[PDB]
Design a protein around this ligand. Structure first.
Ligand code: HEM
Length: 154
């Protein structure tokens, strides 16, 4: 797929807001993901044991990881589609070491769109949401294609 420059602008315009509080947004997103699709929490040995949303919030570790996740995603979105290099090491670790099915990448994509919707309603109207969804679909499709090359597809 290919986003137009106007869609990329709508995506980097909300993203700039997210960047004013990366650790806060990383936390909200990961907790939204775990509560909604709890089976995902099982992929994290590190976090597995967390039982409630209050324990998740208090975890410093979880918060550092959310900053790592958003920083890696932000660097991919800022490429505006030219992200092949950035995608390589990511696709290799998630397909070979962690073993994350494309399905789960669809669940976190949903968690990102819900949290931006909640926090940034004025900058995340229908068109901007359509543009973010397209950028994440682009990301998922390119990651799926790499997974295939690497021998995991799925
Ligand atoms: C927007 C999507 C995602 C991004 C940009 C992302 C990025 C990262 C990065 C940058 C790291 C550290 C370096 C590495 O291991 O590659 C990481 C580790 C990890 N990720 Fe992801 N990830 C994403 C989605 C997910 C999903 C959906 C799952 C599970 C449902 C997952 C599970 C993990 C695990 C198990 C680790 C290791 C955590 C720890 O250090 O023990 N990731 N991810």
């Amino acid at each position: 797929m290919v986003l137009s420059e106007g869609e990329w602008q709508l995506v980097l315009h909300v993203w700039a807001k997210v960047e004013a509080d990366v650790a806060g947004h990383g936390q909200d997103i990961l907790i939204r993901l775990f509560k909604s699709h709890p089976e995902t929490l099982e992929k994290f040995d590190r976090f597995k044991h967390l039982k409630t949303e209050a324990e998740m919030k208090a975890s410093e570790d979880l918060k550092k990881h959310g900053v790592t996740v958003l920083t890696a995603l932000g660097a991919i979105l800022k490429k505006k589609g030219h992200h092949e290099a950035e995608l390589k090491p990511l696709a290799q670790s998630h397909a070979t070491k962690h073993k994350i099915p494309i399905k789960y990448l669809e669940f976190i994509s949903e968690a990102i769109i819900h949290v931006l919707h909640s926090r940034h309603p004025g900058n995340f109207g229908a068109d901007a949401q359509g543009a973010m969804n397209k950028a994440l679909e682009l990301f998922r499709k390119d990651i799926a294609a790499k997974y295939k090359e690497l021998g995991y597809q799925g």
